[PDB]
Ligand SMILES: C[S@@+](CC[C@H](N)C(=O)[O-])C[C@H]1O[C@@H](n2cnc3c(N)ncnc32)[C@H](O)[C@@H]1O
């Protein structure tokens with residue numbers, strides 16, 4: 001049994017109160033106060049629609065993924081990744097696809113910088129979408145579950161779906177459950193063919209083992225996954241560490 005399975009078994013044993021104290025212990029988070037207030041008032045400029053904008057910005061600012069040309073955003077939700085890419089200098093067009101409907105987020109219309117090069121489409125299940133030519137492929141799909149075998153199935157499904165969209169392009173793909181031996185086998189095959197590396201985002205909660213497969217980097221997948229497993233296990237040991245607070249992104253206004 002993997003270090004990740006031991007972390008998941010422990011996570012599943014926590015009371016709601018313990019789970020609530022654990023999930024944000026020692027993580028990094030952006031202060032969403034101003035954006036939440038503005039969005040409640042129906043403000044359409046400056047504010048990121050979700051925490052997703054700051055999450056993708058973390059990778060982009062470290063050159064792990066460099067969005068350019070035609071950006072495809074799979075599982076765009078409210079649109080955090082799409083509106084962030086819309087303001088990047090090398091980006092020319094952003095297309096977002098999301099399921100929507102009961103239990104899922106709907107795209108939020110915004111007037112942030114570069115809103116005019118974005119098209120968000122709801123009622124779209126990516127598992128039935130044929131692949132499209134694109135210069136950047138983004139995918140944030142992976143629903144958490146108390147069952148690691150459910151999470152493993154969801155991860156393999158995403159990995160099999162994304163491959164036909166990968167054609168020597170920039171990419172950032174969520175890997176919900178990267179520690180199961182079957183997932184590691186797929187990721188290593190994918191890394192040999194398309195390159196890139198798996199990276200833990202410090203904005204991720206301790207309640208998820210999610211890592212992101214990004215195009216610009218190299219490294220040992222097994223070592224990186226085991227490093228995250230040891231980190232998350234170690235975070236059960238000590239009393240709650242309040243999260244490190246950072247400033248949220250200002251997405252500005254205007255067209256391009
Ligand atoms: C983690 S959220 C996306 C957050 C987004 N990156 C942002 O910055 O706002 C993942 C999204 O994928 C959507 N989703 C899940 N399964 C889907 C599917 N089969 N096809 C399309 N969208 C799906 C969910 O509704 C959810 O809004």
Ligand SMILES: Cc1ccc(C(=O)O)c(NC(=O)Nc2ccc(Cl)cc2N)c1
Nearest residue numbers: 078099100101102103104105106107122
């Ligand atoms: C459990 C959960 C949490 C968060 C959200 C959210 O949007 O932030 C969410 N959304 C929805 O359930 N949306 C929804 C509900 C009914 C119908 Cl007819 C259409 C939609 N789209 C669901």
